[PDB]
Design an enzyme around this catalytic site. Structure first.
Site, PDB file in Angstrom:
ATOM      1  N   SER A  11       0.747  -1.426  -0.030  1.00  0.00           N
ATOM      2  CA  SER A  11       0.011   0.068  -0.002  1.00  0.00           C
ATOM      3  C   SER A  11       0.865   1.279  -0.298  1.00  0.00           C
ATOM      4  O   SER A  11       0.191   2.336   0.001  1.00  0.00           O
ATOM      5  CB  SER A  11      -1.003   0.248   1.098  1.00  0.00           C
ATOM      6  N   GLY A  63      -2.425  -4.490   1.627  1.00  0.00           N
ATOM      7  CA  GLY A  63      -2.458  -5.557   2.234  1.00  0.00           C
ATOM      8  C   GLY A  63      -1.495  -6.583   1.884  1.00  0.00           C
ATOM      9  O   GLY A  63      -1.169  -7.526   2.689  1.00  0.00           O
ATOM     10  N   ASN A 103       4.177  -5.672   5.334  1.00  0.00           N
ATOM     11  CA  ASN A 103       3.308  -6.495   5.882  1.00  0.00           C
ATOM     12  C   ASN A 103       3.675  -7.773   6.065  1.00  0.00           C
ATOM     13  O   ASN A 103       3.078  -8.569   7.296  1.00  0.00           O
ATOM     14  CB  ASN A 103       1.991  -6.816   4.627  1.00  0.00           C
ATOM     15  N   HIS A 280       0.093   6.416   6.102  1.00  0.00           N
ATOM     16  CA  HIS A 280       0.485   6.160   4.750  1.00  0.00           C
ATOM     17  C   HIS A 280       0.968   7.517   4.188  1.00  0.00           C
ATOM     18  O   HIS A 280       0.272   8.291   4.988  1.00  0.00           O
ATOM     19  CB  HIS A 280      -0.607   5.543   4.176  1.00  0.00           C
TER      20      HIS A 280
END
EC number: 3.1.1.-
Length: 302
Positions: A11, A63, A103, A280
């Site tokens: 992301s 994700g 992640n 983010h």
């Protein structure tokens, strides 16, 4: 001359938070992949420096772990399974750029460990690491607890998977120049700065995250950074080190912040609601990422 290019990634390449999203009304709508992610903008800039990239695919998706590069991605809520990102590569592909790794280390599960706030229904994937250890105990659990061995566990799943990713790329796109993009700095060397809310914000850069938790967090990001850099070194890849120059565009540098806050509102709206940034990159943060990436690609094509 077109430079057949594939963008891939988590992301931080999809640019969770910037809207409009691409595939709004489709299955890939759940990737939260902006229309204007650093990939889109770097292309534009390189076009005008006369570098012409023929983007074949942009399969970044929020994700995405490293292994979603070779495994099917299961989107939330029944959306569907997305094909492995490696499937976007062609033997004629000459350039591959994306960020993968956060992640798999589980940086998401680490925010939820330090935030009760985060431990509630949010659109940020993962569960806390020890659901029973408590939010505030967080800088301790990671520095002294079971979280400390757990980090080292994950760190070793990271080396091995970065290494594998860098080799399926080398296999599938034998001519591809591989560019690994780093994550920009979340927390500054001076945590004191996180202690104030950013102009216009009521809420702190990192919500309820113990302030003492702040320096561990950076330490964890430094590591992750260092793991990605050795991975590219040893893999024949080039690495874009965003962390080294976002030292003053962190979550806490107020108006020069490049990271939207934890609970700060993005541009994303679901029924009549802005979804928060969740740490983010924002517009500025994306402009840097865009710059920096444009910059190295230029280097390598010359």
């Amino acid at each position: 001359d077109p430079v057949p290019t594939v963008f891939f990634g988590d992301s931080y390449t999809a640019n969770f938070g910037i809207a409009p999203v691409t595939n709004q009304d489709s299955e890939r709508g759940w990737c939260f992949q902006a229309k204007e992610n650093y990939p889109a903008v770097a292309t534009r800039s390189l076009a005008d420096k006369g570098i012409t990239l023929d983007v074949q695919a942009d399969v970044s998706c929020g994700g995405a772990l490293i292994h979603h590069f070779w495994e099917k991605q299961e989107l939330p809520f029944g959306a569907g399974e997305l094909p492995p990102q490696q499937d976007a590569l062609k033997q004629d592909t000459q350039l591959t750029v994306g960020s993968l790794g956060g992640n798999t280390l589980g940086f998401n599960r680490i925010l939820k460990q330090c935030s009760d706030e985060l431990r509630k229904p949010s659109l940020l994937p993962g569960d806390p690491v020890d659901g029973d250890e408590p939010a505030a105990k967080c800088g301790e659990f990671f520095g002294t607890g079971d979280g400390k061995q757990w980090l080292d566990d994950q760190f070793e799943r990271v080396g091995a998977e970065l290494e594998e990713l860098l080799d399926r790329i080398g296999y599938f796109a034998p001519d591809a120049k591989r560019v690994l993009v780093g994550y920009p700095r979340l927390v500054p060397e001076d945590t004191t700065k996180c202690l104030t809310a950013a102009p216009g914000q009521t809420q702190l850069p990192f919500a309820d995250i113990p302030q003492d938790a702040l320096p561990v967090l950076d330490q964890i990001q430094k590591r992750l950074n260092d793991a990605m850099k050795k991975a590219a070194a040893d893999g024949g890849a080039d690495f874009v080190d965003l962390y080294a120059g976002t030292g003053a565009n962190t979550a806490c540098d107020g108006a020069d912040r490049g990271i939207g806050g934890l609970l700060e509102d993005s541009q994303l709206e679901l029924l009549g609601t802005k979804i928060p940034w969740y740490a983010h990159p924002n517009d500025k943060g994306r402009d840097i990422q865009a710059k920096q990436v444009a910059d190295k690609i230029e280097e390598i094509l010359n």
